[PDB]
């Protein structure tokens, strides 16, 4: 800052920094809930089970950007890797859904070639799974000069 600067503004004209009046140090201000959060569900008539997708953050520091120390009690199970359900995607990560290797037809689009659906053939009958969508199947037609 300048020697007489007291607060710093942004291009959209809001304070993102301030100088503490007692101890002359600089502090940053950011919104305490910024960034998108998406909830993936089947129908409410179907059994209630949701998955939470964080948009553009890594998922080794979800509790940093969600402030788990003051969030509600039922939100802590969607911000930790106690169960094997937190896996990282290209469009963020999914909490509450298990990954599958077999490709299917897309049901609930998520992004970056990853979809979701209710139920599985693995036992799991109420948990929702996440998979990579399929674009068809291999055919491998053969070429010859006189056929």
């Amino acid at each position: 800052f300048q020697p007489f600067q007291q607060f710093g503004r942004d291009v959209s004209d809001f304070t993102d920094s301030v100088r503490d009046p007692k101890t002359f140090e600089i502090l940053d201000i950011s919104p305490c809930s910024y960034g998108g959060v998406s909830v993936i569900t089947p129908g409410t008539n179907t059994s209630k089970a949701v998955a939470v997708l964080y948009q553009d953050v890594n998922c080794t520091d979800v509790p940093t950007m969600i402030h788990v120390e003051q969030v509600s009690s039922d939100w802590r199970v969607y911000a930790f890797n106690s169960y094997g359900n937190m896996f990282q995607t290209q469009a963020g990560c999914l909490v509450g859904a298990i990954y599958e290797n077999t490709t299917y037809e897309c049901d609930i689009p998520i992004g970056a070639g990853i979809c979701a659906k209710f139920g599985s053939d693995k036992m799991g009958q109420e948990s929702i799974v996440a998979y990579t969508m399929s674009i068809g199947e291999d055919q491998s037609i053969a070429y010859s000069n006189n056929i």
Partner: protein
């Protein structure tokens, strides 16, 4: 009359946008900066923001629908053959390489970095005010796989795999069928196959020089990227407007005035920011309509020129259309149209009909052309003179009244 005696093979390249970027907005972060006494005032305005969210969600769904409609045409991907012995035609430049570092062909690699998708950065200012960008559903690897399955499958199975099952056919016989579909016989192919292959191989290679050194050939596809960035940058700068209030910051108003005098100046900021959001949604809808029209044109071009041979004049290329090759591009598609154009010409004297011994004779699929000594018959698109027989002509009527008829004999094989 003028009839060509030679021809050349050219490759034409055009681009057209297919989809644009998907965006999302949050009113409770844009209109108010985490002010619990601004959310209550915003709540008494109705369901404008649900309308904006539904409009933006519809645009985002339509953007994925466009790229699903354009590229997904076969629903059965074909494995790329390791050999490229297609009768002398080199398909290595438009097909993905074996043991490839990047999962796409060389031409779409060369045009991927030709366009650019991209500390007081504007991205953090957009993120702090609820402006986010959603990734597309189909990644570029699947689009490259779709284009590769179209290419390997157009070359090794003809155009018939787009209407029914795939039929195996040699490449040269397909070339003869397409040449016959132009109007010229399947004679200039088999007698000049090496010339056709050698001219096609460097007509393909000239696209590398036409795309690498020369710029501004993908400006239509760069403007789509630029417009979203300009519209998002001009929206975050409207937050620094008074709109008739004492300040552009809600914290300056709320800390300096009591609660009763606060609404009369908060309302002006709320109305101005709502008007800015209305405007942004309006040009987003209009641009989405234009992109939808362009994507429909790209889809019908994909259907009619890659999966078949089109007889419509100047729909895919300049001259007589033979085939097309699709190439993946960021937010668009690139078409490589192979056409047939005649090059040289030579003057000739022609006649409408020939009266042999009182009966007129008219040609079929050709014209009457003499070379200086006697008369022949030849096709219009290539100078291939043939002797006039009774099979090349048909008797019809009398020769007493035909404008410009001449006297000549007709060969009888008996």
């Amino acid at each position: 009359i003028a009839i060509p005696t030679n021809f050349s093979i050219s490759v034409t390249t055009e681009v057209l946008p297919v989809s644009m970027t998907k965006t999302s907005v949050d009113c409770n972060m844009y209109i108010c900066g985490d002010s619990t006494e601004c959310s209550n005032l915003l709540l008494q305005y109705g369901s404008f923001c649900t309308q904006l969210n539904r409009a933006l969600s519809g645009i985002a769904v339509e953007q994925d629908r466009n790229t699903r409609d354009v590229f997904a045409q076969t629903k059965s991907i074909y494995k790329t053959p390791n050999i490229k012995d297609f009768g002398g035609f080199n398909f290595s430049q438009i097909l993905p390489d074996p043991k490839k570092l990047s999962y796409r062909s060389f031409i779409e690699d060369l045009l991927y970095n030709k366009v650019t998708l991209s500390a007081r950065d504007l991205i953090c200012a957009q993120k702090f005010n609820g402006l986010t960008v959603l990734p597309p559903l189909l990644t570029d690897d699947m689009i490259a796989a779709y284009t590769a399955a179209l290419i390997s499958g157009t070359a090794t199975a003809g155009y018939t795999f787009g209407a029914g099952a795939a039929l195996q056919i040699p490449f040269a016989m397909q070339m003869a069928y397409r040449f016959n579909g132009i109007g010229v016989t399947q004679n200039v192919l088999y007698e000049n196959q090496k010339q056709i292959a050698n001219q096609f191989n460097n007509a393909i290679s000239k696209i590398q020089d036409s795309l690498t050194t020369t710029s501004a050939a993908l400006g239509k596809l760069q403007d789509v990227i630029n417009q979203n960035a300009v519209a998002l940058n001009t929206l975050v700068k409207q937050l620094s407007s008074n709109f008739g209030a004492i300040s552009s910051v809600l914290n300056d108003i709320l800390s300096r005035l009591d609660k009763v005098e606060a609404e009369v100046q908060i309302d002006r900021l709320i109305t101005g920011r709502l008007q800015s959001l209305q405007t942004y949604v309006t040009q987003q809808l209009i641009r989405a309509a234009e992109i939808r029209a362009s994507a429909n044109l790209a889809a019908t071009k994909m259907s009619e020129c890659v999966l078949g041979q089109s007889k419509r004049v100047d729909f895919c290329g300049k001259g007589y259309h033979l085939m097309s090759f699709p190439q993946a591009a960021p937010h668009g598609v690139v078409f490589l149209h192979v056409t047939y154009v005649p090059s040289q010409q030579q003057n000739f004297t022609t006649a409408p009909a020939i009266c042999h011994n009182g009966k007129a004779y008219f040609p079929r699929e050709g014209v009457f052309v003499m070379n200086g000594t006697h008369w022949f018959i030849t096709q219009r698109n290539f100078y291939s003179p043939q002797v006039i027989t009774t099979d090349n002509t048909f008797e019809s009527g009398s020769c007493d009244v035909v404008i410009g008829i001449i006297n000549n004999t007709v060969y009888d094989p008996l």
